[model samples]
Target: GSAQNITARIGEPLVLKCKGAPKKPPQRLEWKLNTGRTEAWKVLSPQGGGPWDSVARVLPNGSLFLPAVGIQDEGIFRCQAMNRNGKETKSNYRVRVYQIPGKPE
Candidate 1:
């Protein structure tokens, strides 16, 4: 089961909340976007890195911050966590991005 479901407005910044991401080297936890049609695993880091390092930023709390979001960004996101003490946790998020109806209102 996923940790929770979240929502975000289109043409706005999106923050993917994840709490169990480990920062310890050699056992650091990571985040990835898993699309069903095509499997794409983009590793998200606390230092703001991975395949989309230019736009993705990982917070100190292991949360993911996207400067801008769009339709293409919609998908299932998972937060993976592991530690030296055999601790492993996975949190999935169903992100829904919607556009507001307005004419420059």
Candidate 2:
């Protein structure tokens, strides 16, 4: 859930986050998305790449940042974490993006 299910307007900025315990800190981190389908998981960030190469990134705080959110970006986001000891943990978020309601002509 999110604090209670995150709701965002289309074309706005959004930040999908994953919070994990800090113990040696994570050496590996990545985010996955399921644009509604259970089997539609896609990598939003690769573990290794040039610092500015990705459209989105894993922040030092262990969070993912989306510069601008849109329809294609709506989905279930899962964050995977691997600590120095190789221990793993995950957090999930259900995101719903909607357009502003308009009056009928």
Candidate 3:
């Protein structure tokens, strides 16, 4: 799968991504949250870099974006790509949502 160098901040949007695998489309591609506590998350579209958010996309390039980030939004995220041919594979992303105290610059 593809990789991304993600640097983030608080109160924004972030996209997670992956690519360059078998070049075959998966029947279902979904991201898994690493933390065992919660099993729910926001879903991004998968179309042209595909149908994700303005801040991110799941296209062939495997790109993800974060618009106006935040501190509590930082964590370890896992992406899963799968097809019926083979088992599912996962990609891990280290999300760093930085926080600057007392300033909105």
Candidate 4:
């Protein structure tokens, strides 16, 4: 089976991940949210690779942080790695965004 799932409350943050990526990895990896070959991919978030205020760090181990995620933030995010070897690996994840039926806490 190929999958990853993150359960999150309506008002909280969530982190979805893909592991076992090649080490000492490529400078920048491609991240597609819910699809492949979309212009939605960018370095500023997934485009710049690093030095992001939103990201504490981006290492060869394939890890990222999505802070203060909202309901709209929920979706499948694909992480793809590339290098001189022309390696391509993909993984999908289901991000569940929940919410309270009533007023603010």
**Best model per TM-score:** 1
How would you encode candidate 1's per-residue C-alpha lDDT over 1-105 as one tens digit per residue? 565777876557877766454453345676778532354455666575454434566666677778766655666787787766787878888877785323422
Q: Each model's C-alpha lDDT?
A: 0.65, 0.61, 0.52, 0.52
TM per prediction: 0.67, 0.63, 0.50, 0.57
Q: Candidate 4, which segments miss by more than 4 Å at Cα? A: 20-24, 35-61, 83-85, 100-105
Query: Per-residue CA lDDT of candidate 3, range 37-100, in tens?
Result: 2442554444534332323345444444555444544556666676566876767766666653
lDDT, candidate 2, 1-105, per-residue tens: 333378876666677666553633446566667763345457765432433322445555656666656655567777677666767767778778785323523
Which regions of candidate 1 fall more than 4 Å away from where they truly are? 22-27, 35-41, 49-54, 99-105
Scored against the true structure, residue 44 in model 1 reaches a CA lDDT of 62
TM-score of model 1 (CA atoms): 0.67
- On TM-score, who's better, 3 or 4? 4
lDDT of 3 at 95: 68
lDDT by residue for model 4 over 8-104, one digit each (tens)? 7645655555543554444566665641124323331333355334432343456556555555455556666655667666767666667522342
**Candidate No. with top lDDT:** 1
Pairs of colliding residues, candidate 1: none
RMSD from true fold, candidate 3 = 6.5
Ranking by TM-score: 1, 2, 4, 3
